[PDB]
Amino acid sequence: CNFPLEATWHYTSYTIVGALYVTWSEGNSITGVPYPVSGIREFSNLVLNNCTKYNIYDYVGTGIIRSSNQSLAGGITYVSNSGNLLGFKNVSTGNIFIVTPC
Amino acid sequence: VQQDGRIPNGFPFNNWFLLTNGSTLVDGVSRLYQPLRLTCLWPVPGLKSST
Amino acid sequence: YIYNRVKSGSPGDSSWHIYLKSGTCPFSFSKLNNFQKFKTICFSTVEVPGS
Numbered sequence A: 001c002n003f004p005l006e007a008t009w010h011y012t013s014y015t016i017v018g019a020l021y022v023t024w025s026e027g028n029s030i031t032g033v034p035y036p037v038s039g040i041r042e043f044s045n046l047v048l049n050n051c052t053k054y055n056i057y058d059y060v061g062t063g064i065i066r067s068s069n070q071s072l073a074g075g076i077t078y079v080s081n082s083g084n085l086l087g088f089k090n091v092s093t094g095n096i097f098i099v100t101p102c
Numbered sequence B: 001v002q003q004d005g006r007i008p009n010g011f012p013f014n015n016w017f018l019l020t021n022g023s024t025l026v027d028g029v030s031r032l033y034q035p036l037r038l039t040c041l042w043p044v045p046g047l048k049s050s051t
Numbered sequence C: 001y002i003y004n005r006v007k008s009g010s011p012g013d014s015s016w017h018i019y020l021k022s023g024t025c026p027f028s029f030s031k032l033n034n035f036q037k038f039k040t041i042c043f044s045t046v047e048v049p050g051s
């Protein structure tokens, strides 16, 4: 599939210049990143206490994340029966985070 | 190894992963097709470069 | 759309039928004369990327 490259002179005339071609297959080996992160050995980001957009273990949405601590024995993802994050446990440790819709 | 190759109920699967070809499950219940019936099981096997 | 069988002067070409097929486009060629509306169009007899 492709992305046509178009040219115009002040949006009067329009013509195609060329195109960018891309192939792909679905899966989870390669991830796009918003900017050229450097220095960091393992990439993640977490903002607390006011609205964010998040991508957390493939759950995507918006809201406010706050830290807490409860004896949540079990896995690392907690969701509603509508598929929305209620919270998550930060894998390497026992800290848990609560996710709310601002 | 139990009769018919079952893993004993109550075992903790300390380092046993589910195999995948793509995505992974994190939390939930489902029917899987996985290499979990044993014909053998060899403890602390003694594998060396001479094996 | 015009098929010039008449170019032969003696239409043995009447045994041939040459016409446009339904295209890969969200419109029928023959219906482009109804009151269809565009911002821009352009037509070509040669391959154009994205067309």
Ligand SMILES: *[C@@H]1O[C@H](CO)[C@@H](O[C@@H]2O[C@H](CO)[C@@H](O[C@@H]3O[C@H](CO[C@H]4O[C@H](CO)[C@@H](O)[C@H](O[C@H]5O[C@H](CO)[C@@H](O)[C@H](O)[C@@H]5O)[C@@H]4O)[C@@H](O)[C@H](O[C@H]4O[C@H](CO)[C@@H](O)[C@H](O)[C@@H]4O[C@H]4O[C@H](CO)[C@@H](O)[C@H](O)[C@@H]4O[C@H]4O[C@H](CO)[C@@H](O)[C@H](O)[C@@H]4O)[C@@H]3O)[C@H](O)[C@H]2NC(C)=O)[C@H](O)[C@H]1NC(C)=O
Pocket: A071, A072, A073, A074, A075, A078
């Ligand atoms: C399939 O896998 C599942 C996924 O992991 C599994 O479910 C999980 O099962 C474990 C059992 O191993 C859950 O156990 C939790 O343990 C808490 C931890 O404390 C215990 O364990 C420590 C480690 O084992 C011990 O150190 C500690 O014991 C010590 O302290 C005691 C207290 O001081 C003392 O008496 C002992 O001597 C000792 O000194 C202890 O034993 C425990 O807190 C936890 O909380 C539940 O119970 C509280 C009491 O009922 C409720 O107050 C809490 O409020 C919990 O109930 C919630 O979860 C139930 C399970 O999900 C629901 O029925 C309830 O409705 C309630 O759910 C609400 O809240 C959830 C938010 O908290 C929300 O998501 C729900 O929608 C709902 O709103 C609990 O025992 C573990 O958490 C289960 N984990 C998960 C994620 O569910 C399931 O068993 C497996 N399937 C099969 C077939 O087995």
Ligand SMILES: *[C@@H]1O[C@H](CO)[C@@H](O[C@@H]2O[C@H](CO)[C@@H](O[C@@H]3O[C@H](CO[C@H]4O[C@H](CO)[C@@H](O)[C@H](O)[C@@H]4O)[C@@H](O)[C@H](O[C@H]4O[C@H](CO)[C@@H](O)[C@H](O)[C@@H]4O[C@H]4O[C@H](CO)[C@@H](O)[C@H](O)[C@@H]4O)[C@@H]3O)[C@H](O)[C@H]2NC(C)=O)[C@H](O)[C@H]1NC(C)=O
Pocket: B019, B020, B021
């Ligand atoms: C990632 O994606 C790959 C994608 O292909 C997938 O690998 C494929 O796995 C299946 C399972 O791992 C392999 O296919 C066959 O599986 C049977 C499984 O046993 C069941 O079925 C038989 C028949 O229904 C029952 O009797 C049995 O009880 C079970 O219920 C194997 O037995 C097949 O093995 C054959 O080949 C061996 C080597 O060639 C022979 O020794 C064996 O005799 C088999 O012969 C049979 O099949 C031949 C097929 O060409 C046929 O010619 C023979 O007559 C005879 O019938 C077999 O392997 C499938 O091969 C796998 N893929 C690849 C690349 O090989 C991965 O599992 C998936 N991974 C994950 C984690 O999802």
Ligand SMILES: *[C@@H]1O[C@H](CO)[C@@H](O[C@@H]2O[C@H](CO)[C@@H](O[C@@H]3O[C@H](CO[C@H]4O[C@H](CO)[C@@H](O)[C@H](O)[C@@H]4O)[C@@H](O)[C@H](O[C@H]4O[C@H](CO)[C@@H](O)[C@H](O)[C@@H]4O)[C@@H]3O)[C@H](O)[C@H]2NC(C)=O)[C@H](O)[C@H]1NC(C)=O
Pocket: A044, A045, A046, A090, A091, A092, A093
């Ligand atoms: C899940 O839980 C783990 C639990 O450990 C969290 O991972 C750790 O994150 C901290 C951040 O959370 C990493 O530790 C250190 O972070 C610094 C981050 O910068 C902020 O904090 C400093 C704190 O002094 C402020 O000055 C600064 O403004 C920022 O606000 C790094 O700069 C540190 O680097 C230094 O130490 C390392 C280790 O000794 C040296 O290699 C570096 O040269 C340097 O001197 C440092 O890394 C901590 O390392 C992380 N944990 C692990 C295991 O690595 C995860 O963040 C959390 N998950 C999520 C999503 O947050």
Ligand SMILES: *[C@@H]1O[C@H](CO)[C@@H](O[C@@H]2O[C@H](CO)[C@@H](O)[C@H](O)[C@H]2NC(C)=O)[C@H](O)[C@H]1NC(C)=O
Pocket: C008, C009, C010, C012
């Ligand atoms: C069949 O014959 C006619 C003549 O019998 C052919 O048409 C003529 O071809 C000549 C030269 O080849 C031209 O000068 C004439 O002017 C043609 N006729 C007309 C009306 O223009 C015809 O092409 C032959 N047709 C075939 C073989 O398909």
Ligand SMILES: *[C@@H]1O[C@H](CO)[C@@H](O)[C@H](O)[C@H]1NC(C)=O
Pocket: A049, A050, A051
């Ligand atoms: C709100 O977000 C801005 C960034 O969007 C940050 O400066 C500020 O501390 C935030 N927190 C709160 C609770 O106001």
Ligand SMILES: *[C@@H]1O[C@H](CO)[C@@H](O)[C@H](O)[C@H]1NC(C)=O
Pocket: A067, A068, A069, A070
């Ligand atoms: C931990 O839980 C207590 C439970 O009573 C709460 O007051 C405290 O803020 C929690 N949060 C954190 C991050 O410690």
